[PDB]
Design a protein around this ligand. Structure first.
Ligand SMILES: N[C@@H](CCC(=O)O)C(=O)O
Length: 256
């Protein structure tokens, strides 16, 4: 039998979530969401079973001062996992160190805040001094600001970096709590904003999308699965299955 593939992933609504049950769940049965459905589809097409393992450090992945990576990216580089099936953003810096599939979903960074302010854009947000802002530590939004040569974004990075202890949150859930409970705006991917703002009517997107990019399945460089995965993703795309999966996990339809 084909060796069981090790899948690195991360908890993120509605991509990967704990299933609610009144009875014990083990292994993969503990999880549900868009990425679990994607895995079910991909594994059918490619002919494997798999073992879902949450990334031990709970990070997506970024490189430090010394050039060392962490998170799911590190798991792939170190061949601790065969695949990363998660909302893993396809970026230039990452693509140099792992092999991504073609994208299964598109998105862009935008702003999540409460309602009622005159802040209408990143420019507004960077200029004002009332509201703090940041991003998930060691994810692609953080790295976007870190690498930016756009003046407003350079300022925003200097600010986030200066206030890193507080401004850079552990995960999206903690960032949402910080938005709700303090004067803080979260720089968050638009698909995640879409999800949360249709469920919590106290939240809103501010401004438009600041960039445009995709989520892809990650594999270690040289993986024999990456191209097979790309082909499977395109099949699912063309068959309308990716669209259906998005409708299943995002619907409805929740706030004015
Ligand atoms: N999808 C991002 C994590 C979320 C974010 O950075 O806003 C990543 O792959 O690193």
């Amino acid at each position: 039998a084909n060796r069981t593939l090790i899948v690195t992933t991360i908890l993120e609504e509605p991509y990967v979530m704990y299933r609610k049950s009144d009875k014990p769940l083990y292994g993969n049965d503990r999880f549900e969401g868009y990425c679990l459905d994607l895995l079910k589809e991909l594994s059918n097409i490619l002919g494997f079973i798999y073992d879902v393992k949450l990334v031990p450090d709970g990070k997506y992945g970024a490189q430090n001062d010394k050039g060392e990576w962490n998170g799911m990216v590190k798991e792939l580089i170190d061949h601790r996992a065969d695949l990363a099936v998660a909302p893993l953003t396809i970026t230039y810096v990452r693509e140099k160190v792992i092999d991504f599939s073609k994208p299964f979903m598109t998105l862009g960074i935008s702003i999540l805040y409460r309602k009622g302010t005159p802040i209408d854009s990143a420019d507004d947000l960077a200029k004002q001094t009332k509201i703090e802002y940041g991003a998930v530590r060691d994810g692609s939004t953080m790295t976007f600001f870190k690498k930016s040569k756009i003046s407003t974004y350079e300022k925003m990075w200097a600010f986030m970096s200066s206030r890193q202890q507080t401004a850079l949150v552990r995960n999206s859930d903690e960032g949402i709590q910080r938005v709700l409970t303090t004067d803080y705006a979260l720089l968050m991917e638009s698909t995640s904003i879409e999800y949360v703002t249709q469920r919590n009517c106290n939240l809103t997107q501010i401004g438009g999308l600041i960039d445009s990019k995709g989520y892809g399945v990650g594999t270690p460089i040289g993986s024999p699965y990456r191209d097979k995965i790309t082909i499977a993703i395109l099949q699912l795309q063309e068959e309308g299955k990716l669209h259906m999966m998005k409708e299943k996990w995002w619907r409805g339809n929740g706030c004015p």
